[PDB]
Write a protein that binds this DNA or RNA. Structure first.
Ligand SMILES: [Mg+2]
Ligand SMILES: [Mg+2]
Ligand SMILES: [Mg+2]
Ligand SMILES: [Mg+2]
Ligand SMILES: [Mg+2]
Ligand SMILES: [Mg+2]
Ligand SMILES: [Mg+2]
Ligand SMILES: [Mg+2]
Ligand SMILES: [Mg+2]
Ligand SMILES: [Mg+2]
Ligand SMILES: [Mg+2]
Ligand SMILES: [Mg+2]
Ligand SMILES: [Mg+2]
Ligand SMILES: [Mg+2]
Ligand SMILES: [Mg+2]
Ligand SMILES: [Mg+2]
Ligand SMILES: [Mg+2]
Ligand SMILES: [Mg+2]
Ligand SMILES: [Mg+2]
Ligand SMILES: [Mg+2]
Ligand SMILES: [Mg+2]
Ligand SMILES: [Mg+2]
Ligand SMILES: [Mg+2]
Ligand SMILES: [Mg+2]
Ligand SMILES: [Mg+2]
Ligand SMILES: [Mg+2]
Ligand SMILES: [Mg+2]
Ligand SMILES: [Mg+2]
Ligand SMILES: [Mg+2]
Ligand SMILES: [Mg+2]
Ligand SMILES: [Mg+2]
Ligand SMILES: [Mg+2]
Ligand SMILES: [Mg+2]
Ligand SMILES: [Mg+2]
Ligand SMILES: [Mg+2]
Ligand SMILES: [Mg+2]
Ligand SMILES: [Mg+2]
Ligand SMILES: [Mg+2]
Ligand SMILES: [Mg+2]
Ligand SMILES: [Mg+2]
Ligand SMILES: [Mg+2]
Ligand SMILES: [Mg+2]
Ligand SMILES: [Mg+2]
Ligand SMILES: [Mg+2]
Ligand SMILES: [Mg+2]
Ligand SMILES: [Mg+2]
Ligand SMILES: [Mg+2]
Ligand SMILES: [Mg+2]
Ligand SMILES: [Mg+2]
Ligand SMILES: [Mg+2]
Ligand SMILES: [Mg+2]
Ligand SMILES: [Mg+2]
Ligand SMILES: [Mg+2]
Ligand SMILES: [Mg+2]
Ligand SMILES: [Mg+2]
Ligand SMILES: [Mg+2]
Ligand SMILES: [Mg+2]
Ligand SMILES: [Mg+2]
Ligand SMILES: [Mg+2]
Ligand SMILES: [Mg+2]
Ligand SMILES: [Mg+2]
Ligand SMILES: [Mg+2]
Ligand SMILES: [Mg+2]
Ligand SMILES: [Mg+2]
Ligand SMILES: [Mg+2]
Ligand SMILES: [Mg+2]
Ligand SMILES: [Mg+2]
Ligand SMILES: [Mg+2]
Ligand SMILES: [Mg+2]
Ligand SMILES: [Mg+2]
Ligand SMILES: [Mg+2]
Ligand SMILES: [Mg+2]
Ligand SMILES: [Mg+2]
Ligand SMILES: [Mg+2]
Ligand SMILES: [Mg+2]
Ligand SMILES: [Mg+2]
Ligand SMILES: [Mg+2]
Ligand SMILES: [Mg+2]
Ligand SMILES: [Mg+2]
Ligand SMILES: [Mg+2]
Ligand SMILES: [Mg+2]
Ligand SMILES: [Mg+2]
Ligand SMILES: [Mg+2]
Ligand SMILES: [Mg+2]
Ligand SMILES: [Mg+2]
Ligand SMILES: [Mg+2]
Ligand SMILES: [Mg+2]
Ligand SMILES: [Mg+2]
Ligand SMILES: [Mg+2]
Ligand SMILES: [Mg+2]
Ligand SMILES: [Mg+2]
Ligand SMILES: [Mg+2]
Ligand SMILES: [Mg+2]
Ligand SMILES: [Mg+2]
Ligand SMILES: [Mg+2]
Ligand SMILES: [Mg+2]
Ligand SMILES: [Mg+2]
Ligand SMILES: [Mg+2]
Ligand SMILES: [Zn+2]
Lengths: 218, 37, 141, 122
RNA sequence: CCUAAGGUAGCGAAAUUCCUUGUCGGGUAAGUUCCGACCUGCACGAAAAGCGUAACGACCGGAGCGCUGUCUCGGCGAGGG
RNA sequence: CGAUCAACGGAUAAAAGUUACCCCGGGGAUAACAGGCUGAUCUCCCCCGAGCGUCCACAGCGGCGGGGAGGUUUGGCACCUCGAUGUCGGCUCGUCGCAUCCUGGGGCUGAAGAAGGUCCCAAGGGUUGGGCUGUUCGCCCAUUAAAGCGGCACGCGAGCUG
RNA sequence: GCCCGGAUAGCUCAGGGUAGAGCAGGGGAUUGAAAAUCCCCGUGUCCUUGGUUCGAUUCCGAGUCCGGGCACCA
RNA sequence: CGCGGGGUGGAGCAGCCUGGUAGCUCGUCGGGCUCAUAACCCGAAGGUCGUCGGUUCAAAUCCGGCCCCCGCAACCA
């Protein structure tokens, strides 16, 4: 049967036995003046709204009304602002719920240092999710606590990573008193360090700070 | 302005001139304006 | 990138870089060629970068003749190491090119395609070069 | 004449009892803070269940100082303590009562809310 | 598989831990030091004693209070030069 | 005829270590500091235009390869100094370069504005206070127009610290 | 970035004449019904995109990525 | 990097001073015992010896290249 992937994209049913993930869609009507229409349609395209209908209320001459079925999530921040800006303010909007619908959606998992961070599991449309993952991976890179070992940051569409970033690798300048000249003495200290980073990489459980979550989730 | 060692036409509306020793490109597209340097 | 499949000797002395090229001075297989104007050890990585550049330019069509082969091993001491303790390790292979040598030839390709692929390819090599077109003089050779 | 390290009495009901100045918010390298200047400060002592607690980093306006301030009429005024009221980014008190006299300079420097809450403006 | 036998108790990033500012927790507005913990002990370990221990120490760390020209930051004054 | 007298022209028939408790004669014939020469390495700048950038090689980027500059890194070499050229870091006092951190002037922008990005000019002045650690660095706290980077024997011990 | 390779089913994987197996499942056999065991069965757009071939997972490109080398990395 | 050792059925080890021969224990598989499982008993398979090259009539063996693993060393500044 059916039920709702609720306030937890992580808490799915097992995408093993699955066949339809449903977005909420919405009946979206746009009262533009003139042929800002051209702008408007490009906007609703990348918002993945199907164009169902358009009608001219003639008289002078501008006035066009556009009807769209668009994923409910694809408004919600961003849209209203961009409706207003590409139309110098003259575009209006109204909508009502108009049900649910199948969507080609992917589960994108985010693992830091090999461990899946559930708190950052989301869900997107395969046309966009890379660009979504290409983004979080890099913002997470800039706010994760730099460790004693280099920390990988990754995003996977089920068992296949698609976007990769790496945190350093805080290290000790082990060669600081090395004005001998003999390269063997630099190698000795360099080997030991390389071996240790392996060891700290393998057993190194990094935790994401609650200050990083807020930084990625603004 | 694009200040480079190798200044060249970028589009066919680009035009190549010599100016104060350095080679210049001027064009109706300001992105293509280059002087050598 | 090219290296010999086997060698009698692993290391060999640097030699001099004198004279015009001994042979390979006439277009022999294609319609256009790139010829060297100065001597150099052209490395394999360079040859590979020139090949690929012209390939990319012939994404559909074309034959590329690479007429120089990097058979001379290139030696380098390990870094931060004093002089002595034997000759460096092989870290690569080079091809000895003297001026007049035909290094690459293209065929099956319009004149514009040929002189553009060879122009990029020149930009990948450490030497000045000249683009040439098969002559009656090549045929006579 | 407050500078980092200096302890101020907090003259409000926010719960702080002592704060230590960690920076005077006036220019890029100001040496000192006087009446009506803003400091960043660490809460060093507080009463339980207050609004601010020990360890918090707060903003505050100096409200009295022990070094006398000189006035353009030719007079000067001096207090027995260096004291402050904790404020927010809008320069508004975070408490609802201010205690003790405060200096008249707070009015021009834009702390009217504090000036009225005070029991005396000298 | 090998050994004469394969390090017990206790202790452990230590006057020992290299990698290393290990990790976690405390203390600080902020702590490569310090304290508590963990155990991956490069390379603790039982009279070259192991783990503790009240008292004692011009021994060496870490924190706070008090008080200060140490300092912000320098001024003045005295005497012997 | 007895020699791995193999350190193979073969010192004794017969021989290992250690010195931070060290000593003398010598050497800048020879290392460590700094200088120098060099510039692999390092920093910076270019050439080429493959690939990003919804569209678009060049707003911002720049595969593979190619050319240089600098002389701040680690080095190579062993040229003056071993009848001595005192080390790192700090404090103090600076002064210089500019590959500019801020401030002044511009061009381009994927520059509406404001605010950015990027490159060009520009060295007059300015470029904070703290926690940790000997640290230079760096990380953190609180600010700031900014919290520049380098040279001066990695400026500066007949100036101090230690 | 680089040298070696390595991206094949929901997962872990064997490999120039269109590629399978364990596994997860769904169903079935066994049972009184389960557990365990066993049988049966898929969508592979052989990672993405382009080209090479009469025939490409294979070969040539490019793109993103994974495991080990160097290198940046108080 | 320098020195020394090593890489052989699925695992852990012989064999190589030494050229012609691959062995031990466990594991796996087929059969027995048992009501059944293990233990135990009988029988069998599985190694071209890391990889390329050389020497040889003949290479696990001897010699060299390359790859990887282990131990030791890297000091006076
Ligand atoms: Mg030195
Ligand atoms: Mg160009
Ligand atoms: Mg014009
Ligand atoms: Mg070369
Ligand atoms: Mg050489
Ligand atoms: Mg030499
Ligand atoms: Mg060499
Ligand atoms: Mg060239
Ligand atoms: Mg106090
Ligand atoms: Mg009070
Ligand atoms: Mg507390
Ligand atoms: Mg025993
Ligand atoms: Mg022991
Ligand atoms: Mg024990
Ligand atoms: Mg420990
Ligand atoms: Mg510790
Ligand atoms: Mg130890
Ligand atoms: Mg720490
Ligand atoms: Mg803590
Ligand atoms: Mg605390
Ligand atoms: Mg805390
Ligand atoms: Mg804290
Ligand atoms: Mg800590
Ligand atoms: Mg500690
Ligand atoms: Mg402790
Ligand atoms: Mg002991
Ligand atoms: Mg012992
Ligand atoms: Mg004993
Ligand atoms: Mg004792
Ligand atoms: Mg004890
Ligand atoms: Mg007792
Ligand atoms: Mg005791
Ligand atoms: Mg004592
Ligand atoms: Mg302290
Ligand atoms: Mg004084
Ligand atoms: Mg005096
Ligand atoms: Mg006197
Ligand atoms: Mg002898
Ligand atoms: Mg001799
Ligand atoms: Mg002799
Ligand atoms: Mg002789
Ligand atoms: Mg004799
Ligand atoms: Mg002796
Ligand atoms: Mg000795
Ligand atoms: Mg001693
Ligand atoms: Mg003595
Ligand atoms: Mg003694
Ligand atoms: Mg003596
Ligand atoms: Mg002398
Ligand atoms: Mg000399
Ligand atoms: Mg000599
Ligand atoms: Mg010096
Ligand atoms: Mg000198
Ligand atoms: Mg140079
Ligand atoms: Mg030079
Ligand atoms: Mg340049
Ligand atoms: Mg593109
Ligand atoms: Mg464009
Ligand atoms: Mg120099
Ligand atoms: Mg030098
Ligand atoms: Mg020198
Ligand atoms: Mg000489
Ligand atoms: Mg000397
Ligand atoms: Mg002497
Ligand atoms: Mg003298
Ligand atoms: Mg200091
Ligand atoms: Mg300076
Ligand atoms: Mg300039
Ligand atoms: Mg700049
Ligand atoms: Mg400016
Ligand atoms: Mg704007
Ligand atoms: Mg503006
Ligand atoms: Mg700016
Ligand atoms: Mg600008
Ligand atoms: Mg200036
Ligand atoms: Mg300056
Ligand atoms: Mg300290
Ligand atoms: Mg500013
Ligand atoms: Mg600072
Ligand atoms: Mg120096
Ligand atoms: Mg110095
Ligand atoms: Mg001194
Ligand atoms: Mg000193
Ligand atoms: Mg002197
Ligand atoms: Mg000392
Ligand atoms: Mg002393
Ligand atoms: Mg540091
Ligand atoms: Mg084995
Ligand atoms: Mg034998
Ligand atoms: Mg059996
Ligand atoms: Mg029964
Ligand atoms: Mg071999
Ligand atoms: Mg033979
Ligand atoms: Mg053979
Ligand atoms: Mg045999
Ligand atoms: Mg053989
Ligand atoms: Mg010694
Ligand atoms: Mg030393
Ligand atoms: Zn143009």
């Amino acid at each position: 049967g059916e039920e709702v992937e609720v306030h937890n994209p992580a808490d799915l049913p097992d995408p093993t036995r699955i066949e339809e993930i449903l977005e909420p869609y919405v009946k979206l009507t746009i009262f533009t003046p003139e042929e800002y229409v051209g702008s408007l349609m490009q906007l609703l395209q990348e918002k993945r709204g199907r164009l169902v209908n358009m009608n001219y209320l003639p008289g002078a001459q501008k006035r066009v009304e556009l009807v769209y079925e668009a994923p409910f999530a694809e408004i919600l921040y961003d849209f209203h602002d961009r409706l207003k800006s590409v139309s110098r303010g003259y575009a209006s909007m109204d909508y009502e719920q108009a049900g649910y619908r199948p969507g080609d959606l992917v589960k994108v998992n985010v693992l830091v240092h090999g461990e899946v961070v559930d708190a950052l599991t989301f869900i997107a449309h395969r046309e966009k999710a890379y660009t979504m993952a290409r983004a979080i991976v890099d913002k997470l890179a800039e706010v994760i606590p730099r460790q004693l070992f280099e920390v990988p940051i990754q995003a996977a569409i089920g068992g296949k990573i698609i976007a990769r970033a790496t945190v350093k690798a805080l290290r000790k300048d082990v060669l600081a008193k090395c004005y001998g000249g003999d390269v063997t003495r630099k190698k000795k200290l360099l080997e030991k360090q390389k071996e240790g980073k392996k060891r700290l990489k393998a057993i190194g459980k990094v935790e994401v700070p609650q200050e990083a979550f807020l930084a990625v989730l603004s | 302005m694009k200040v480079r060692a190798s200044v060249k036409r970028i589009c066919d509306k680009c035009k190549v001139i010599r100016r104060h020793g350095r080679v210049y490109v001027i064009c109706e597209n300001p992105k293509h304006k280059q002087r050598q340097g | 990138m090219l290296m010999p499949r086997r060698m009698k000797y692993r290391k060999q002395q640097r030699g001099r870089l004198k004279g015009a090229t001994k042979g390979g001075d006439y277009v022999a297989f294609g319609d256009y060629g790139l010829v060297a104007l100065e001597p150099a050890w052209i490395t394999a990585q360079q040859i590979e970068a020139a090949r690929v550049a012209m390939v990319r330019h012939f994404r559909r069509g074309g034959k590329i003749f690479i007429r120089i082969f990097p058979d001379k091993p290139y030696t380098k001491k390990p870094l931060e190491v004093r002089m002595g303790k034997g000759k460096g390790n092989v870290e690569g292979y080079v091809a000895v090119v003297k001026p007049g040598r035909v290094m690459f030839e293209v065929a099956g390709v319009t004149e514009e395609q040929a002189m553009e692929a060879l122009r990029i390819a020149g930009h990948k090599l450490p030497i000045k070069t000249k683009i040439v077109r098969r002559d009656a003089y090549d045929e006579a050779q | 004449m407050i500078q980092p390290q200096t302890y101020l009495e907090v003259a409000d009901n926010t719960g702080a009892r002592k704060i230590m100045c960690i920076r005077v918010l006036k220019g890029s390298n100001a040496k000192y803070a006087t009446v009506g200047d803003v400091i960043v400060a660490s809460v060093k002592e507080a009463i339980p269940r207050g609004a601010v607690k020990e360890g918090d980093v707060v903003k505050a306006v100096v409200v009295r100082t022990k070094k006398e301030i000189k006035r353009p009429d030719g007079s000067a005024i001096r207090f027995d303590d260096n004291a402050a009221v904790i404020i927010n980014n809008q320069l508004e008190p975070r408490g609802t009562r201010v205690f003790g006299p405060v200096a008249r300079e707070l009015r021009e420097k834009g702390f009217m809310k504090i000036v009225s809450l005070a029991p005396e403006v000298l």
